[PDB]
C-alpha cells in the first residue's frame, strides 16, 4: 500500500535501512501491523535481498520462543511496518541484540511520550535509547521524529490502551558490537 511505498522510496529502496542483496534481515510485526502493509514490505525485502539473502518474519510475541541462531542477522527492522504502533520491552531488545551478528544493525520505530508519565508503559525517547544501550547495542542514535496519523493515534488507543497529547514516533538505530 501507499504507506509501504512511501517507506520504500523515502529510504532509498530501503538502502537507508541497510537492506541490499545478500543481507539477512528479520522484520518484527505485531497485531497493530496492517496485514497488507506487512505483506507489501516483506515482498519488497525479499526482492531486495534476493536468493543469497534471507527475510525472516517474526511476530514480536513469538520472537523469544522462535530462538533464532545467535549472531545470524545483518539487519533487524522492528515497529516499522507502516501503521504499526509497537512498544519494545527490555527482553525484546536483548533478544534482538542476541540474534544480530556483530556489526549488525537494528532500526526501530516506537511511539514515545514527550514527557515522563509513570501511569503508562510508553517511554520517552531517552529511556528508549537507554534501553537499547542496556541491551548491549552501541552507536545508538535517533534518526527521525514523526507525528502520528489519526489511524496511528487510534491504534495507540486500541492496542496500547493509552491516550496522550505528546505521542510522537521516534526512529532509532543501534549496532551490535563485537564481544569484549
Instruction: Note the residues at the interface with Hg ion (CB under 5 A).
Output: 18, 105
Rounded to a whole number of angstroms, the minimum distance from the CB of residue 139 to Hg ion is: 8
Q: How far apart are CA 98 and CA 79, in angstroms?
A: 18
Which residues fall within 8 angstroms of residue 119, CB to CB, at 6 or more apart? Answer: none
Residue ranges of the alpha helices (H) in the chain? 2-10, 35-49, 63-66, 90-99, 125-134, 150-160
Would you say 74 or 110 has its CB closer to Hg ion? 74
Rounded to a whole number of angstroms, the minimum distance from the CB of residue 123 to Hg ion is: 22
Would you say 41 or 105 has its CB closer to Hg ion? 105
Longest dimension (CA), the chain: 47
Rounded to a whole number of angstroms, the minimum distance from the CB of residue 141 to Hg ion is: 10
Would you say 50 or 103 has its CB closer to Hg ion? 103
Amino acid at each position: 500500500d501507499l504507506g509501504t511505498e512511501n517507506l520504500y522510496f523515502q529510504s532509498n529502496a530501503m538502502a537507508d535501512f541497510g537492506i541490499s542483496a545478500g543481507q539477512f534481515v528479520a522484520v518484527v510485526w505485531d497485531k497493530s501491523s496492517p496485514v497488507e502493509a506487512l505483506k507489501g514490505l516483506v515482498d519488497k525485502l525479499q526482492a531486495l535481498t534476493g536468493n543469497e539473502g534471507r527475510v525472516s518474519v517474526e511476530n514480536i510475541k513469538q520472537l523469544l520462543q522462535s530462538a533464532h541462531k545467535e549472531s545470524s542477522f545483518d539487519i533487524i527492522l522492528s515497529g516499522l511496518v507502516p501503521g504499526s504502533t509497537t512498544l519494545h520491552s527490555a527482553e525484546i531488545l536483548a533478544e534482538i541484540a542476541r540474534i544480530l551478528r556483530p556489526g549488525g544493525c537494528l532500526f526501530l520505530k516506537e511511539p514515545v511520550e514527550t514527557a515522563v508519565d509513570n501511569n503508562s508503559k510508553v517511554k520517552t525517547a531517552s529511556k528508549l535509547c537507554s534501553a537499547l544501550t542496556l541491551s548491549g547495542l552501541v552507536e545508538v542514535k535517533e534518526l527521525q521524529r514523526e507525528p502520528l496519523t489519526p489511524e496511528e493515534v487510534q491504534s495507540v488507543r486500541e492496542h496500547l490502551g493509552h491516550e496522550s497529547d505528546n505521542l510522537l514516533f521516534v526512529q532509532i538505530t543501534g549496532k551490535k558490537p563485537n564481544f569484549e
